[PDB]
Design a protein around this ligand. Sequence first.
Ligand SMILES: C#CCn1c(=O)c2c(C)c(C(=O)C3=C(O)CCCC3=O)ccc2n(C)c1=O
Ligand SMILES: C#CCn1c(=O)c2c(C)c(C(=O)C3=C(O)CCCC3=O)ccc2n(C)c1=O
Ligand SMILES: [Co+2]
Ligand SMILES: [Co+2]
Lengths: 377, 377
Amino acid sequence: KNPKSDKFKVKRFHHIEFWCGDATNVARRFSWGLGMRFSAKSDLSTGNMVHASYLLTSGDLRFLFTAPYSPSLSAGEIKPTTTASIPSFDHGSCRSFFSSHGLGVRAVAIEVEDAESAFSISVANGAIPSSPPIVLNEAVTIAEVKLYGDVVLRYVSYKAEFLPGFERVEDASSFPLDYGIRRLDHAVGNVPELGPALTYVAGFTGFHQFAGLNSAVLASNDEMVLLPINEPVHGTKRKSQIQTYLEHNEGAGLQHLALMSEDIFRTLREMRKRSSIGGFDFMPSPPPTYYQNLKKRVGDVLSDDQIKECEELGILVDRDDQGTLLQIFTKPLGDRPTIFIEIIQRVGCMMYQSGGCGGFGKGNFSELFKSIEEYEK
Amino acid sequence: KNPKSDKFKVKRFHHIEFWCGDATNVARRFSWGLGMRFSAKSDLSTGNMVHASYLLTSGDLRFLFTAPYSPSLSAGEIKPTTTASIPSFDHGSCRSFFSSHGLGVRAVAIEVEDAESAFSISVANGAIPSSPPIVLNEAVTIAEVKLYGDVVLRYVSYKAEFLPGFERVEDASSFPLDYGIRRLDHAVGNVPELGPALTYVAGFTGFHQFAGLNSAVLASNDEMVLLPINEPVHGTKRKSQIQTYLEHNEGAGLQHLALMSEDIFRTLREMRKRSSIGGFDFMPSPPPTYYQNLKKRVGDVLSDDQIKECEELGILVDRDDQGTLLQIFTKPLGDRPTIFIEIIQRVGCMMYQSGGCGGFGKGNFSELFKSIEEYEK
Ligand SMILES: C#CCn1c(=O)c2c(C)c(C(=O)C3=C(O)CCCC3=O)ccc2n(C)c1=O
Ligand SMILES: C#CCn1c(=O)c2c(C)c(C(=O)C3=C(O)CCCC3=O)ccc2n(C)c1=O
Ligand SMILES: [Co+2]
Ligand SMILES: [Co+2]
């Protein structure tokens, strides 16, 4: 059931912005680890005296990394005279965010038809304003409301290249890395209480519910914007990873970004080659019993050779009533056991592929558990 | 003239510690960019609830990257019960350092015979104490005094593997990268006023003077610990890079680390291959006139093919009355135009090679200038 109740016209995920201590080092690490190319910049060399912002892209996936300069460089500025390219940026907010939470996502940005309308409608329907609509070079409008914790939902709308004031990055510094990642599939928040978080976000967006934790998924009309939210379940045998997150993050925040690959086998080969030479590590692989049990579960979707390739790369498989999901999880992206990345590819639900085809892999909690005890034999 | 006036027994450079917002991402970037292997760790997985510290090594070069966790994880600790492996660490100091200066060097660590004596003698001779001598597991003593700005000179002494509480890093996460870097040759500070900085440091160490800026070099008895210091020269045609540093760094601090390579050609080939895929960029190469002029300057030291290899890699060459220096400079290591790295290799002064053989490349300021105007032809 999709009641299509969006209160404003939403298109797709647009970008994810990380708030960093040093944007250069995080961006370079992420570029090599994920196969994303340097696409745009806004920094001292472009006249920005306030913040350094570097954009990585892979396909339609856009990762922005931002860090503040010394406030002294912009001490004579006021908002009407700012050299910042992202007008919502604030030195104190950024330093406080990073001190509190460490490296993590500040903004989940979605493209909308009209950021000013989306902002007004959101706030009229309960959204906590974070940054009012600001028109950039009469070409792009950006606005922000609180999503959960210190994460904002950013609306961006275009009259007609990332943002005004950003410069495209010269060829020599833009190595065309590509490991197959193509778009953001979903972005997941951890909160102390799921009910109030869902009511708030669904309240101001009109997003509907999509068919050690409790979780639920909010979706836009065409179910291409997907925002799962998790709460911890206390008292369990093993401590909830949601609760560990909330402790080390100092509260609610973005838990994982799921990145769709057009070839998850190639993506994982390339990322795993780089794990120990600057890239990302992956969670421990499932036991062989898990891949033995895949024949009964998805033997009609994946061949034996494809199942063996899943085993070689540590890939997990889950299945909907409609589609099949291939997924795998990185270890945390930074010092704290907080944010991590999921790589996914979906098969089925062809009409284009409908959003969320195959689900989110919740069935892999039991399948992993069963395979572990089975393997303990 | 070397009066050998060290006030305590100094051995060699031991390590350099960077204070970071996220140690993981900086360390992984540096590992790939410089060819340094992950050698030791102190973090949540080793029982450290206070800071994350990761050690990279290449030969005798030791780079330590440290970032604070949430203070909440250690709120019940006091110094007598700390889980920090580096007892001088302080959350507030680290966050304030990074907020003020961005990514940069907190500690220049030298190995001494007795860190407690070195500390006492230093302070008795004018050093500003920063952290008193603390004995770690009855095996290692560490102490810190102020060097310049918020950089400390750290003394470490060993009774008889990096520091107690650090764990050696498992093989799988310790890829044996190596681009030829072998040790720290010198560490350079930028200050507003050279005179008072030299008087202070030479005052408490007994280090002697080694034979857009004014600079001088302080050296230990065997001239293996080398600490140049720069001040800006104001009013010049081009703005002093020392002054730009001081503005963007919010004052005095470490300007560059010079890393000795046992094969600077291999090091630069390997680093340049990685510049645009997560590693480090290099300053713009000299014009062809510079390499034409090398024949007259060092044609007795380097063959034509070796001179051409210098041209291929953008390497600079300078000459003492005793030796020859090959050097090259990276672009800044992070967002701010502050700290950068120098790669060097020295030829001559064989006895082992004596310290500072060939000088520090000051002659390359004029040689670059001349070659630029000559090339403008
Ligand atoms: C690392 C680690 C441990 N771990 C996971 O984190 C994990 C995750 C994070 C998902 C997932 O993507 C997801 C959503 O997208 C919305 C629904 C709730 C949720 O959990 C699915 C399976 C997982 N499995 C099996 C697992 O073992
Ligand atoms: C980047 C950039 C511009 N740049 C440098 O920074 C540069 C440096 C930093 C050195 C150097 O190593 C050094 C010392 O070790 C102690 C003495 C003072 C000093 O400067 C030598 C030559 C240099 N040249 C030619 C140059 O062009
Ligand atoms: Co997911
Ligand atoms: Co130097």
